[PDB]
Structure formats: structure tokens, C-alpha cells
Write a protein that binds this ligand. Structure first.
Ligand SMILES: CS(=O)(=O)Nc1cccc2cccnc12
Ligand SMILES: [Mn+2]
Ligand SMILES: [Mn+2]
Ligand SMILES: [Mn+2]
Ligand code: NA
Length: 258
């Protein structure tokens, strides 16, 4: 449970994280390397935002952002040799620390000519984040929120990745609680005002199972189906929530009141 002043620090950090995604958007084009995208992000964070990437060095992570293409579910490592191409779907997952507090958000970019199925998976995944956000208010259990995401996603013939989840966030990067995106008999966390955490559903076109690669980081779908993710950092309010990482292109308001 964060203090008013700490919540303010989270607004600042969350805005910065959102702004990295706004900044990078025009660079997300056929032909660019994920390596360069990462350099551009890191330069912006250090030099213009006077912040730091939370990811760089975190538990040994080598880069400043995670960039995940098509069948890669999460933790794609920027690389100078990996070029974006027409029809790709790409997640850029950003976390910045500013004044001791973390802001954590990601979105999908569609590269070149969108494919109908890429467009669909991306839209449905964002909608699954959106429906979750509209549920958030004190007195609700996280279990219900995980359950609703799962129900929505699967009704689309998609699946929810189980190995990854949203999380409490503040002066730490991945704090309690775990925010599962599916119904779990383990989840029992009733929301309270001032809690800050993320919601970050990872949705596969095919089966839920994943595979980790040999670089200690990159995760793909076991069946090599497409996978998409969107993420926001939020604070629970008296009556709902406030999205700390909102972007210009978000089709949901910052403050959600009940
Ligand atoms: C820093 S990171 O964005 O690459 N993410 C992570 C790093 C290290 C450990 C993690 C565990 C769960 C989820 N994300 C993790
Ligand atoms: Mn991560
Ligand atoms: Mn993230
Ligand atoms: Mn996160
Ligand atoms: Na993907």
C-alpha cells in the first residue's frame, strides 16, 4: 500500500515508461534491428528522461528493453542481426526506474502490412487487459480478474500463458502479489486502495505451452503459434483504479471510476 507521495513518484515513473513506447513507435518499421530499437530506447531513458532501465542488469538481463517478435512470448533479447519484417507483430516491454520507483508497460506494434490474424490476436489481447482494468476496485479478488481474462481469451480460441504473470511493483520491480491471468485455486488476494501492480496477459494463438531457448531468456510458444502481450501499471483507488502508464493511443481512460 503506497503513500500519496509514493503514488506521485509512480505517476512520474509510469509516465516515463509510457513515453518510451510513444517515442519508439515511428522507428518500428520493416528493416530496423531490434538491437537498434533497444539503443534508441536506452539513450532516451538515460539522456532525455534522466531515468534508468530497470531491465538492464536485472537478474543479469543484458539489454534495456525486451523485444519479442511473433512466436516469441516474452523476454526477446534485442540483437543487431534480428530485423523486423512486413507482417511481424512485435512487443516492446519497458521498465524504467525514476526517483526509486518502477514504471512497467508494454504494447504490440504491427510491422508493415498487418495480417488479419496478427491484428486480431493483438486487439483481443489488449481487450483482455482492458476488461481486467475495468474490473479493478477494492473488495474484488485477483482470482476473479484472472478468471475473466482467461474466459475472454479462450472464447476467442486463444490460450493464456501460465508461467508469467503481473505483479506488485514500487521500489521493487517484481513484488507481491502475483497477478495471474487465469483462474487459479491458489489465488486469494482482495484488492485494497493504494496497492500498485501490473496486469500483463500473454496470449497465444495456439496452445498455452512454452519453450525457453538457450540464451537463458528468450521464450517461444512450444507450437510456434503467434503470441501477444499488453501491460499497464496501475494503482487501486477508493472506487476503481488509475492507469499510471497510459499512452496517447490507449482507447481506455486514465482514471476508471465505479
Ligand atoms: C527485467 S525483465 O524485463 O527482463 N523481466 C524479468 C527479469 C528477471 C526475472 C523476471 C521474472 C519474471 C518476470 N520478468 C522477469
Ligand atoms: Mn519480465
Ligand atoms: Mn513489463
Ligand atoms: Mn511487468
Ligand atoms: Na510474440
Amino acid at each position: 500500500i503506497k503513500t500519496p507521495e509514493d503514488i506521485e513518484k509512480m505517476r512520474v515513473a509510469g509516465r516515463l515508461a509510457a513515453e518510451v513506447l510513444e517515442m519508439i513507435e515511428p522507428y518500428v518499421k520493416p528493416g530496423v534491428s531490434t538491437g537498434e530499437l533497444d539503443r534508441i530506447c536506452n539513450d532516451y531513458i538515460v539522456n532525455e528522461q534522466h531515468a534508468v532501465s530497470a531491465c538492464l542488469g536485472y537478474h543479469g538481463y543484458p539489454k534495456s528493453v525486451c523485444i519479442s517478435i511473433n512466436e516469441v512470448v516474452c523476454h526477446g533479447i534485442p540483437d543487431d542481426a534480428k530485423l523486423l519484417k512486413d507482417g511481424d507483430i512485435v512487443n516492446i516491454d519497458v521498465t524504467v526506474i525514476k526517483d526509486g520507483f518502477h514504471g512497467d508497460t508494454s504494447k504490440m506494434f504491427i510491422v508493415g502490412k498487418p495480417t488479419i490474424m496478427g491484428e486480431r490476436l493483438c486487439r483481443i489481447t489488449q481487450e483482455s487487459l482492458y476488461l481486467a482494468l475495468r474490473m479493478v476496485k477494492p473488495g474484488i479478488n485477483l482470482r476473479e480478474i484472472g478468471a475473466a481474462i482467461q474466459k475472454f481469451v479462450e472464447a476467442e480460441g486463444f490460450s493464456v500463458v501460465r508461467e508469467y504473470c503481473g505483479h506488485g511493483i514500487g521500489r521493487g520491480f517484481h513484488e507481491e502479489p502475483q497477478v495471474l491471468h487465469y483462474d487459479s485455486r491458489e489465488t486469494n488476494v482482495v484488492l485494497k486502495p493504494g496497492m500498485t501492480f501490473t496486469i500483463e496477459p500473454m496470449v497465444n494463438a495456439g496452445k498455452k505451452e512454452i519453450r525457453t531457448m538457450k540464451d537463458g531468456w528468450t521464450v517461444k510458444t512450444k507450437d510456434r503459434s503467434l503470441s501477444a502481450q499488453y501491460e499497464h501499471t496501475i494503482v487501486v483507488t477508493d472506487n476503481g483504479c488509475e492507469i499510471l502508464t497510459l499512452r496517447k493511443d490507449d482507447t481506455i481512460p486514465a482514471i476508471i471510476s465505479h
